[PDB]
Amino acid sequence: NQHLCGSHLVEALYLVCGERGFFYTPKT
């Protein structure tokens, strides 16, 4: 339905990944 862009994307990563942080491409 909706696209995740801009500040919305970074804030969603904050919640989904939590304190562990994230990568620019998947680690597997």
Place this chain on the structure above:
Amino acid sequence: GIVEQXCTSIXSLYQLENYCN
């Protein structure tokens, strides 16, 4: 990368979780 997958295209919570450390 993620802009293509999530902003230009549609990405699920499952795909977003693949970027987590």
